[PDB]
């Protein structure tokens, strides 16, 4: 019933930044977390007298249920890369050296030789299926010199991903802490919203 954004795990849905839902795969996301904010209503919407219109994420528009170049998870919402592959929005935000082509639409994603050289270089300490602990790219805990490594989506599941507020003026506002260094209150509500996101999509 409650709508949760699968990128930031926030639950606020206002008229300016609405949490929307893909009508084929079911994922739910803030307009602003996916680059579809402030866009005009579709041409198909003139046919309806209803207040809502169908919407489809980019993977479904292309008829794929892709895998991510940067992690082993199959859930969540994706953006296409310049090479025709796919990455999670969340992985693109948190992995260093990965940037969005234009910030307004968050499209496309350009992955470099430097990104690919990090493949498998660290073992993800949170993978539940060790067969994948060395796929993709890990980030590390951002507390001091802590060298704890994990996939962005594995860290998301444990409620470890944080975003600084805009007023804080931190050039890279996306950061993560391992469980040893995390804010316990923040982990709690993020884990709670993650578990509700899993029950709603299924």
């Amino acid at each position: 019933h409650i709508l949760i954004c699968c990128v930031c795990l926030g639950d606020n849905s206002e008229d300016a930044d609405e949490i929307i839902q893909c009508d084929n795969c079911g994922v739910t996301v803030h307009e602003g977390c996916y680059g579809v904010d402030g866009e005009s209503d579709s041409i198909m919407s003139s046919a309806s007298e209803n207040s809502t219109e169908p919407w489809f994420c980019d993977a479904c528009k292309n008829g794929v249920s892709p895998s991510c170049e940067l992690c082993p998870s199959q859930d969540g919402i994706f953006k296409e890369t310049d090479a025709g592959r796919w990455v999670h929005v969340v992985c693109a935000l948190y992995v260093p050296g990965v940037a969005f082509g234009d910030i307004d639409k968050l499209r496309p994603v350009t992955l470099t030789e430097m990104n690919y050289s990090k493949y498998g270089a660290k073992e993800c300490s949170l993978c539940e299926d060790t067969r994948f602990a060395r796929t993709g790219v890990c980030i590390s805990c951002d507390a001091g010199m802590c060298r704890s490594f994990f996939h962005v989506t594995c860290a998301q599941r444990e409620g470890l991903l944080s975003e600084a507020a805009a007023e804080e003026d931190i050039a890279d506002p996306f950061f993560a802490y391992c469980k040893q260094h995390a804010d316990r209150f923040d982990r709690k509500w993020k884990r709670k919203n993650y578990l509700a996101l899993q029950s709603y999509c299924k």
């Binding site: 008229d15 307009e31 579809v36 207040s51 809502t52 919407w55």
Partner: peptide, 9 residues
């Protein structure tokens, strides 16, 4: 789905 902006205040 996505609420049309005509239906947003």
């Amino acid at each position: 789905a996505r609420t049309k902006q005509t239906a947003r205040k």
